[PDB]
């Protein structure tokens with residue numbers, strides 16, 4: 209484990225995702241509202257999945273070597289197995305908050321799968337220049353997601369209860385800022401141009417992951433928007 | 440790329456799926472009917488997924504070598520990753536058109552997963568004679584799907600609006616004819632008996648894919664069956 | 671095939687899953703109740719999936735070698751591909767029986783995916799002591815599932831029709847007893863401590879699989895709880 213300088217950030221990430229999972233699990237014990245139960249189930253699964261994948265990276269299972277640039281490059285593939293399941297769950301939290309229609313939910317989840325799937329292909333591609341073709345396709349899929357979150361959901365939240373509109377607006381802004389950083393870290397990190405070393409890259413993804421999952425969840429599950437209007 | 444004679448058909452397929460995706464995306468911009476939005480989302484995702492997998496084959500990522508018959512045989516595995524997601528989406532288009540019940544939808548999607556999954560196992564199997572055992576199981580799963588589309592959905596469409604009944608009947612006939620060709624191309628192509636060479640096999644799958652996805656989508660999204668009855 | 675002593679139990683399992691699939695398929699022909707159709711579709715898919723994965727193990731495709739303990743250990747990975755899809759389908763049978771809320775269904779299916787996913791990682795892990803870390807995480811996920819089936823569903827079934835309450839109680843008890851045996855067989859078998867040899871381990875999993883899928887299905891599909899109350 210300790211033979212890799214980035215191990216400290218993988219261990220911290222593992223701990224923070226595990227602690228986040230347990231807090232949400234305990235906090236959700238005393239909840240019977242069927243609407244609130246939906247948000248607790250979605251939001252608790254997110255850091256639980258991330259916990260297992262951070263642990264796999266810490267123990268060395270989620271790491272492979274990819275030859276490109278005449279070098280064997282360490283690629284943590286477990287990140288994409290994490291994101292494949294956690295990013296659509298996070299979008300479902302937002303879509304259920306605004307009572308989005310089914311067709312829009314399917315478009316979001318499908319574009320998200322394309323985003324993560326093409327990012328994985330780009331991470332494992334051995335022809336250096338082709339890695340950035342996949343990065344560009346994946347980034348186009350992300351821009352579609354961000355467009356929908358702004359010019360489809362925002363207008364839908366305003367016609368909703370005030371507390372669900374204000375909570376959505378906050379979580380929307382958090383998501384757009386944090387998610388946009390991921391393609392940048394990829395491009396300048398060891399998967400892309402190799403400007404930033406792997407140990408610093410790992411620290412950046414850990415800060416982003418914890419903020420986008422645990423921080424996101426703390427804002428959502430403390431809001432009254434997750435409960436139905438009741439007397 | 441150009442070192443493979445089949446590259447021209449992979450490049451054409453990539454272009455036609457990309458163009459198809461963009462047309463459906465633009466055409467769906469001016470749509471607010473929640474029913475129509477469902478069909479546009481399903482139908483636009485189909486060629487978008489196929490685009491990415493054709494590109495992976497063009498660039499050489501979606502290709503592996505499988506030893507059988509005393510030879511290293513080029514097997515494009517990316518086809519099955521495509522079909523795993525696009526064939527159930529196409530069946531969902533048909534099932535939603537006739538307002539099929541949930542139990543029937545699950546049976547269709549499950550049989551479809553078995554069809555594609557066993558076809559993938561057959562494509563990667565190293566014992567030559569066993570490849571055709573998997574082909575037979577996969578073909579049995581397809582025949583179940585075709586039976587349901589005829590002796591379960593057809594009777595359901597007649598009790599529906601006339602425009603949804605006539606549109607379903609057309610898309611049903613297109614699907615049964617085109618899908619039935621796939622097991623035949625597999626059997627006589629490089630995955631099976633090896634009668635037809637890979638470059639011709641690739642041309643045939645490209646014609647079938649574009650027809651079953653883009654051609655299918657053009658018929659559906661030009662129909663009024665996708666809109667609810669409104670004044 | 672016959673070069674492996676466990677082949678006899680893989681062949682028996684294949685036959686019993688295939689026969690089970692055909693019986694459920696025939697029995698479900700004469701069913702039009704939309705509620706009953708749901709249970710028949712879920713319950714017939716379970717042994718059909720298991721059939722294909724037992725066949726892959728029989729023919730040698732679903733087997734790999736994992737080095738640990740200074741030895742190349744035969745690991746049947748196809749079991750986890752089976753369980754990944756069949757265990758959530760079995761939980762869906764139970765959840766639909768008691769009309770569970772959506773949030774609870776998602777929590778069950780998500781915990782089940784974590785259970786199977788971490789068990790697969792543990793089966794393929796090359797550092798011997800780490801294999802049991804994954805076993806423990808997977809077992810914690812199972813205990814969560816069992817808790818929900820007892821202290822969330824049981825109370826919900828009592829407020830239901832008497833026949834659905836008594837049928838659920840029976841299937842609940844069958845599930846908790848049979849599922850609990852799996853982590854024990856893993857721990858003492860070739861994936862874990864290696865006390866029980868592989869051929870005996872394979873026999874035990876076959877008895878458990880057939881009972882948990884075909885036996886489970888025979889109890890459910892003979893009950894009147896799967897039909898709506900009708901005159």
Ligand SMILES: CC(C)CCC[C@@H](C)CCC[C@@H](C)CCC[C@@H](C)CCOC[C@@H](CO)OCC[C@H](C)CCC[C@H](C)CCC[C@H](C)CCCC(C)C
Nearest residue numbers: 317318321322325326328329332488491503516519520524
């Ligand atoms: C509606 C939305 C959900 C739609 C989703 C969008 C999606 C279509 C976007 C594209 C996804 C696609 C790129 C997934 C590729 C997975 C692949 C990286 C797995 C590893 O295989 C890659 C190479 C080794 O580098 O295999 C070496 C050769 C091996 C012999 C490969 C044989 C196994 C194949 C991988 C079998 C295909 C399985 C499916 C891809 C499983 C789904 C994986 C997940 C990442 C989507």
Ligand SMILES: CC(C)CCC[C@@H](C)CCC[C@@H](C)CCC[C@@H](C)CCOC[C@@H](CO)OCC[C@H](C)CCC[C@H](C)CCC[C@H](C)CCCC(C)C
Nearest residue numbers: 548549552553556557559560563719722734747750751755
């Ligand atoms: C309700 C419906 C959706 C049900 C679906 C029906 C489905 C059950 C039908 C059978 C599907 C099954 C054959 C999928 C097999 C995937 C497999 C080809 C992936 C590549 O692995 C094959 C060998 C190399 O040749 O791995 C070499 C050895 C490696 C060490 C393998 C270890 C990884 C395992 C593959 C882990 C299992 C992952 C799941 C199979 C992922 C789903 C893939 C998709 C193709 C279903």
Ligand SMILES: CC(C)CCC[C@@H](C)CCC[C@@H](C)CCC[C@@H](C)CCOC[C@@H](CO)OCC[C@H](C)CCC[C@H](C)CCC[C@H](C)CCCC(C)C
Nearest residue numbers: 257260272285288289293779780783784787788790791794
């Ligand atoms: C809501 C719920 C459904 C959530 C589900 C819970 C889930 C997150 C729990 C953890 C699942 C995770 C451990 C799955 C790992 C699959 C992995 C074993 C496949 C084989 O790859 C392992 C190594 C060889 O030993 O690959 C060698 C290196 C290769 C180069 C690997 C590159 C391919 C990657 C495997 C791509 C990721 C694909 C996804 C993991 C596909 C889903 C598989 C299924 C088992 C979940």
Ligand SMILES: *C/C=C(C)/C=C/C=C(C)/C=C/C1=C(C)CCCC1(C)C
Nearest residue numbers: 327346347350387390391394417420
């Ligand atoms: C909890 C994890 C989250 C919210 C991860 C989000 C990840 C992304 C938005 C990743 C995007 C990428 C691109 C847009 C292209 C480059 C490759 C990716 C996958 C890093």
Ligand SMILES: *C/C=C(C)/C=C/C=C(C)/C=C/C1=C(C)CCCC1(C)C
Nearest residue numbers: 558577578581618621622625648651
């Ligand atoms: C857009 C792609 C489509 C509609 C693909 C359809 C593919 C099939 C219907 C494939 C069927 C197969 C068999 C029936 C057995 C032989 C292997 C397959 C997977 C080619």
Ligand SMILES: *C/C=C(C)/C=C/C=C(C)/C=C/C1=C(C)CCCC1(C)C
Nearest residue numbers: 789808809812849852853856879882
């Ligand atoms: C039809 C198959 C069924 C119902 C299989 C159930 C399997 C389990 C409940 C497996 C559980 C495991 C653990 C709890 C940890 C050890 C590894 C597993 C996956 C065997």
Ligand SMILES: CCCCCCCCCCCCCCC
Nearest residue numbers: 389390392393403404405408412
């Ligand atoms: C979206 C965030 C990207 C900003 C990356 C900042 C990295 C600064 C760290 C110093 C770079 C290390 C280079 C010298 C080793």
Ligand SMILES: CCCCCCCCCCCCCCC
Nearest residue numbers: 224227228231418419422423426
């Ligand atoms: C009462 C609110 C705080 C509860 C404690 C939460 C502990 C989980 C770890 C959170 C750290 C990361 C927060 C986002 C920066």
Ligand SMILES: CCCCCCCCCCCCCCC
Nearest residue numbers: 620621623624634635636639643
């Ligand atoms: C379902 C369509 C299958 C028909 C295949 C027709 C192939 C004819 C092309 C000529 C065969 C090439 C053999 C000589 C190289």
Ligand SMILES: CCCCCCCCCCCCCCC
Nearest residue numbers: 455458459462649650653654657
């Ligand atoms: C107005 C209808 C035609 C629009 C142009 C569609 C261009 C997408 C490519 C379609 C070619 C394949 C059609 C099926 C044979």
Ligand SMILES: CCCCCCCCCCCCCCC
Nearest residue numbers: 851852854855865866867870874
């Ligand atoms: C949950 C069931 C686990 C019980 C396992 C009993 C196995 C007894 C078979 C004899 C053990 C073989 C050891 C000598 C070869």
Ligand SMILES: CCCCCCCCCCCCCCC
Nearest residue numbers: 686689690693880881884885888
């Ligand atoms: C009339 C009920 C029996 C029908 C025959 C079922 C045959 C399928 C194989 C069942 C054997 C396994 C039963 C569970 C132990």
Ligand SMILES: CCCCCCCCCCCCCC
Nearest residue numbers: 523524527528531544548552
């Ligand atoms: C194995 C991959 C299957 C999933 C394909 C994605 C489409 C799923 C459609 C689900 C239809 C709704 C069923 C109720």
Ligand SMILES: CCCCCCCCCCCCCC
Nearest residue numbers: 754755758759762775779783
């Ligand atoms: C990782 C594979 C999980 C999918 C298994 C297929 C069954 C899914 C059941 C979904 C139940 C409906 C939830 C609302």
Ligand SMILES: CCCCCCCCCCCCC
Nearest residue numbers: 347351354355358388391392
């Ligand atoms: C185009 C939709 C408007 C909202 C999206 C904001 C774009 C942020 C740019 C992200 C940069 C990634 C490289």
Ligand SMILES: CCCCCCCCCCCCC
Nearest residue numbers: 578582585586589619622623
């Ligand atoms: C048996 C259901 C009737 C409709 C299915 C038509 C069968 C077409 C044969 C396809 C040939 C594939 C080898």
